[PDB]
Amino acid sequence: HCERLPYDASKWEFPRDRLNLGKPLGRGAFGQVIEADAFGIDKTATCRTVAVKMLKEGATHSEHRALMSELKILIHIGHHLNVVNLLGACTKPGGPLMVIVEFCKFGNLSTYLRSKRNEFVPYYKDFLTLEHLICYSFQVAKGMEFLASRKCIHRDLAARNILLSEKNVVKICDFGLARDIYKDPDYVRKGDARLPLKWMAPETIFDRVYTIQSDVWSFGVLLWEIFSLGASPYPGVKIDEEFCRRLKEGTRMRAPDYTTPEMYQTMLDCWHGEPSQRPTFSELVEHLGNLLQANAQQD
Numbered sequence: 001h002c003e004r005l006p007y008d009a010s011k012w013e014f015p016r017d018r019l020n021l022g023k024p025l026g027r028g029a030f031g032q033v034i035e036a037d038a039f040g041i042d043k044t045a046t047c048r049t050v051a052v053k054m055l056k057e058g059a060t061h062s063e064h065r066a067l068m069s070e071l072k073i074l075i076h077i078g079h080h081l082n083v084v085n086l087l088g089a090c091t092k093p094g095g096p097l098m099v100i101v102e103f104c105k106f107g108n109l110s111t112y113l114r115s116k117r118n119e120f121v122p123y124y125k126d127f128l129t130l131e132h133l134i135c136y137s138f139q140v141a142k143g144m145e146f147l148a149s150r151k152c153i154h155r156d157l158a159a160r161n162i163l164l165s166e167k168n169v170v171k172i173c174d175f176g177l178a179r180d181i182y183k184d185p186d187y188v189r190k191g192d193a194r195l196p197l198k199w200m201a202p203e204t205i206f207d208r209v210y211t212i213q214s215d216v217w218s219f220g221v222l223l224w225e226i227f228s229l230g231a232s233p234y235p236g237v238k239i240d241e242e243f244c245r246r247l248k249e250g251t252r253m254r255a256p257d258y259t260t261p262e263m264y265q266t267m268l269d270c271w272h273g274e275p276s277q278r279p280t281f282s283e284l285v286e287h288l289g290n291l292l293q294a295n296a297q298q299d
């Protein structure tokens with residue numbers, strides 16, 4: 001829902017005097033995220049690194065409302081291992097509105113996988129393997145199955161919106177910063193931005209239609225990103241009216257360099273032209289769970 005939903009301060013409110021703000025993690029035109037140290041945020045006697053979303057200086061009513069809405073949305077969604085974890089909030093008088101979520105130390109999965117291209121083998125202590133890639137895929141499907149059950153649609157499911165925490169746990173998020181149409185051109189490097197059109201289901205381009213089944217299409221692109229180790233989709237292709245036409249017609253990406261046949265089949269399944277014929281997230285959880293277990297079995 002929205003900023004007007006009730007807010008259970010007993011459950012969520014965290015003292016500002018137990019938050020020590022550190023360095024920025026991300027900044028856009030409408031909000032910023034800062035790394036922070038929070039003491040006792042999960043009831044134990046520990047100092048935990050967290051990420052704090054808050055407003056920038058000079059924020060309007062509209063911006064405040066937007067951040068309050070996000071907070072209520074996150075409370076509504078609830079907790080899942082593979083979704084951005086809301087830990088607390090600072091909303092009462094005497095300081096800025098702050099939304100506190102778990103920090104995922106390895107950052108976004110696209111950049112991470114790119115950094116591991118020379119540290120990948122199919123089947124080496126710090127290497128990635130097929131086991132890793134299929135596990136990340138499975139985890140995202142689990143998170144999306146959960147989001148679907150909360151009646152949420154992601155709308156921009158991509159590897160850049162997946163964060164990697166310790167112990168190879170990935171979490172789905174939606175930064176909502178718009179960093180790459182905000183970033184100073186002096187400091188923009190190749191790789192910083194991505195083109196969201198490349199993740200959109202045909203019906204999302206042509207009918208502006210967002211559904212859970214359009215997220216399944218996007219998940220197929222995310223799979224392609226995983227098994228290309230963080231490459232950009234549709235390499236070399238110009239994303240114009242022509243590309244869109246070809247897409248509605250049946251043209252698809254070729255297999256990425258690190259895929260197994262079964263994973264490329266799944267991509268193709270996710271890219272069905274008919275939304276109702278794409279797998280559901282529940283179906284993807286079962287199938288990828290099977291692929292994961294088969295991957296690690298004995299002879």
Ligand SMILES: COC(=O)Nc1nc2cc(Oc3ccc(NC(=O)Nc4cc(C(F)(F)F)ccc4F)cc3)ccc2[nH]1
Nearest residue numbers: 025033051053070084102103104105106107172173174175
């Ligand atoms: C190098 O290491 C790193 O930099 N590590 C790291 N950097 C960061 C940055 C960070 O900022 C964020 C992320 C997301 C967010 N909110 C957000 O997800 N909201 C959201 C999610 C969803 C849905 F569907 F995805 F679940 C639906 C609607 C919705 F509003 C707020 C702040 C959080 C954690 C983190 N860890």
